[PDB]
Structure 1
Amino acid sequence: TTQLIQQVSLTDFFRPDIEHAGSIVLILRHPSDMIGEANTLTQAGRDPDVLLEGLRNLFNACTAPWTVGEGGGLRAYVTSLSFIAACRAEEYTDKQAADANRTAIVSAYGCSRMETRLIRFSECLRAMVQCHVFPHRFISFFGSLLEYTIQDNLCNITAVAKGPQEAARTDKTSTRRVTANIPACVFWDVDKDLHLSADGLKHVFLVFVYTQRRQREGVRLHLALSQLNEQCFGRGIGFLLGRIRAENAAWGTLPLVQLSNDPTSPRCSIGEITGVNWNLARQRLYQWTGDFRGLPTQLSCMYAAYTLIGTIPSESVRYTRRMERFGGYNVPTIWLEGVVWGGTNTWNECY
């Protein structure tokens, strides 16, 4: 048996009738929390008003831009993997597998105000990295798409948040069953790039990749298969992303044993400590200036993040690539057979 979540939301970044049932959908945190976290977490020497400006610029080119502040309950909760994959559709290596997704998602949502709502989303995601509130703190894994029902601008989404994907009865159409589905741009199996084995249970991860370079940084989203547990998938992707790790490290920003071993060195006592003296504290004991400034940090050198969202408990994992009609156009997709969705969306960052 499985579980299902249900969430009614707006219809800006997710139109759940062009989406094939079985695609993965993502949840979006309330945007008013970025304007609170940016004040504290931005790096000293940068204007935090860039993220505020981009965020205000995004929702102006959206649906009804009211109650987009605090007291608003009904809003745009959910977005699809295809949308984020199509806004950053220039940072994926497979250009042919990504530009088709972008074209189909622009010309398929039946809207002209789209392609002006995708440029804003990408600018917002790029700012969020520049202000050091990364997208991996405001997006997570809502269940696979199972069943829907829509009205004028109002959609109701059903998902599957646990248990086997294929043990889920969709009464609507087409064999009453639903299979996992992702666009071929975001997919890459690390066990092939690391030249690892094939037979065995595989996990399914969600990987964010961060590049730290002022005014020209970037971020993309991936869905990976691997025979490596969460404690060793970081050592995995830490090897296939050397040119990003190194460039982020360097383009995003006391002899106590001796004196303590010298029994003739100037030393005060526990009963002598009156630091109010301008001599006893400063002049007598060994002076040293700290200068812990501009030094590499954690939030600066962080180049990637990942979380375990599921698993594939087969002997040999089998996936296809069949170009499916994405509402008028055809996009390279990938069908994953036999996925059992895990949870506890705990992100692990790299450095």
Structure 2
Amino acid sequence: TTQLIQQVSLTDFFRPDIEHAGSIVLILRHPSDMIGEANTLTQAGRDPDVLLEGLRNLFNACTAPWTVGEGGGLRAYVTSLSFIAACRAEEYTDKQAADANRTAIVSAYGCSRMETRLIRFSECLRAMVQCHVFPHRFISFFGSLLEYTIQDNLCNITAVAKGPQEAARTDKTSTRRVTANIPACVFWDVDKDLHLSADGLKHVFLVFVYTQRRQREGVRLHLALSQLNEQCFGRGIGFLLGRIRAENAAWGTEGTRALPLVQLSNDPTSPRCSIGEITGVNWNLARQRLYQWTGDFRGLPTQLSCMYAAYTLIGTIPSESVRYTRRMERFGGYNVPTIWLEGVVWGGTNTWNECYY
């Protein structure tokens, strides 16, 4: 059930630093395909020049423009976990430490043009989010890379999947077993609504909510971990975010006489002439009164306004009753706070089953 699959990538969205475990890598999509698909889903409302400007800026900022969009299997299609943590995990648990970690990372990795790249990425993400385009419809499940190697300007890291990774005894790490750790921003408080004991096997879910406000938008890549059923995850998310769900619904309405005589005209006085009065006469002059509704509307977009909750079954645990310990680690050129866990594996499928409210 375990396979060794490696990807031929040199430097896409990562630096040739010391490899570390507990990293999650996703697969992006070509901007041309997404803009070609969304040119009809935009439905006007915003100027399309900002998207083109953002795409041009991203193409210019990306290294080796002659390799992206052509060639073989060498392109920009993967993203390291460090970039995601620096861009999203900064205002979740402890800001006064998250900002220090981000500054240390951007000072130790780039040290020459890291701030410009970070601001360009932030602006491109804001442009790609404000245009009411969801990129999660193309992301597929990917494995976790776990390998230690180095070469002359080359690095080939293999990936593993669900199975006996910790029991295979590869004898290639510091200890006789493998290392499995997760960052600080992996668990959120749930006892306030789940005071009942979590007797059972817990599940790991990835949550990516969406916001819709007045000319302002943001991303929130949370990581839920609850024993509740999959169908109740959306209800729990809606209940937890009930203070902002109403505001989102009110701000999402962007982009009248009823008929109470039906109950009285159903049985008596029924002018059922939908065939006899149409197939016989031309009906080009008898259409005088009819109904008018005393209104005029064109388009009622509601499906793309109430979508604010999502969850996917990614990652499981071989055993329950997992206990987390808060400790410190010293590695690399700087000491950063980390949380050590045990009995955690990866795998699964990226089956998007959302429940909007």
Superposition TM-score tier, normalisation by shorter sequence: 0.7 to 0.9
Task: Give, in whole Å, the separation in 2 of the partners of 1:191 and 1:291.
Answer: 49
Task: Give, in whole Å, the separation in 2 of the partners of 1:186 and 1:339.
Answer: 12
Q: Is the 2:19–2:147 contact (alpha carbons within 8 Å) kept by the matching residues of 1?
A: no
Q: Is the 1:7–1:157 contact (alpha carbons within 8 Å) kept by the matching residues of 2?
A: yes
**Deviation digits for residues 263-288 of structure 1, max 9, x if unmatched?**
32544222433599675685243333
SS of residue in 1 equivalent to 2:149: strand
When residues 219 and 212 of structure 1 are mapped into structure 2, their CA distance, relative to the original with a 3 A threshold, is same
Q: Is the 1:83–1:105 contact (alpha carbons within 8 Å) kept by the matching residues of 2?
A: no
Quote the offset at 1:196 in angstroms: 4.0
Quote the offset at 1:131 in angstroms: 1.8
**Deviation digits for residues 218-261 of structure 1, max 9, x if unmatched?**
002122211023222111222222233222211133x5833751
Q: Is the 1:200–1:227 contact (alpha carbons within 8 Å) kept by the matching residues of 2?
A: yes
Q: Is the 1:309–1:342 contact (alpha carbons within 8 Å) kept by the matching residues of 2?
A: yes
Q: Is the 1:5–1:161 contact (alpha carbons within 8 Å) kept by the matching residues of 2?
A: no
Q: Is the 2:181–2:342 contact (alpha carbons within 8 Å) kept by the matching residues of 1?
A: no
Aligned counterpart, 2:332: 327
Q: Is the 1:88–1:122 contact (alpha carbons within 8 Å) kept by the matching residues of 2?
A: no
Q: Is the 2:69–2:75 contact (alpha carbons within 8 Å) kept by the matching residues of 1?
A: no
When residues 107 and 304 of structure 1 are mapped into structure 2, their CA distance, relative to the original with a 3 A threshold, is farther
When residues 145 and 69 of structure 1 are mapped into structure 2, their CA distance, relative to the original with a 3 A threshold, is closer
Superposition RMSD on alpha carbons, in Å? 3.2
When residues 172 and 34 of structure 1 are mapped into structure 2, their CA distance, relative to the original with a 3 A threshold, is same
Q: Is the 2:68–2:76 contact (alpha carbons within 8 Å) kept by the matching residues of 1?
A: no
Identity %: 100
**Deviation digits for residues 157-177 of structure 1, max 9, x if unmatched?**
322232355345555331153
Task: Give, in whole Å, the separation in 2 of the partners of 1:100 and 1:13.
Answer: 22
SS of residue in 1 equivalent to 2:103: helix
Q: Is the 1:189–1:226 contact (alpha carbons within 8 Å) kept by the matching residues of 2?
A: no
How many residue pairs get matched? 350
Quote the offset at 1:8 in angstroms: 2.0
Quote the offset at 1:148 in angstroms: 4.7
Quote the offset at 1:100 in angstroms: 3.5
Quote the offset at 1:334 in angstroms: 2.8
TM-score by length of 2: 0.83
TM-score by length of 1: 0.84
**Deviation digits for residues 33-56 of structure 1, max 9, x if unmatched?**
222222122243112333332233
Aligned counterpart, 1:215: 215
**Deviation digits for residues 155-207 of structure 1, max 9, x if unmatched?**
43322232355345555331153333332135325456643423421111111
Q: Is the 1:129–1:212 contact (alpha carbons within 8 Å) kept by the matching residues of 2?
A: no
Task: Give, in whole Å, the separation in 1 of the partners of 2:172 and 2:280.
Answer: 78
SS of residue in 2 equivalent to 1:295: coil
When residues 292 and 66 of structure 1 are mapped into structure 2, their CA distance, relative to the original with a 3 A threshold, is farther
Q: Which moved more, 1:340-349 or 1:290-299?
A: 290-299
Task: Give, in whole Å, the separation in 1 of the partners of 2:264 and 2:286.
Answer: 17
Q: Is the 1:165–1:179 contact (alpha carbons within 8 Å) kept by the matching residues of 2?
A: no
Aligned counterpart, 2:30: 30
SS of residue in 2 equivalent to 1:289: coil
Q: Which moved more, 1:308-317 or 1:49-58?
A: 49-58
Quote the offset at 1:74 in angstroms: 0.8
Q: Is the 2:130–2:216 contact (alpha carbons within 8 Å) kept by the matching residues of 1?
A: no
Q: Is the 1:162–1:342 contact (alpha carbons within 8 Å) kept by the matching residues of 2?
A: yes
Quote the offset at 1:308 in angstroms: 0.6
When residues 232 and 21 of structure 1 are mapped into structure 2, their CA distance, relative to the original with a 3 A threshold, is same
SS of residue in 1 equivalent to 2:116: coil
Segments of structure 2 that go 5 or more residues without pairing to the other structure are 254-259
**Deviation digits for residues 44-103 of structure 1, max 9, x if unmatched?**
311233333223312322321223235564112221333112113455353135324422
Q: Which moved more, 1:92-101 or 1:226-235?
A: 92-101
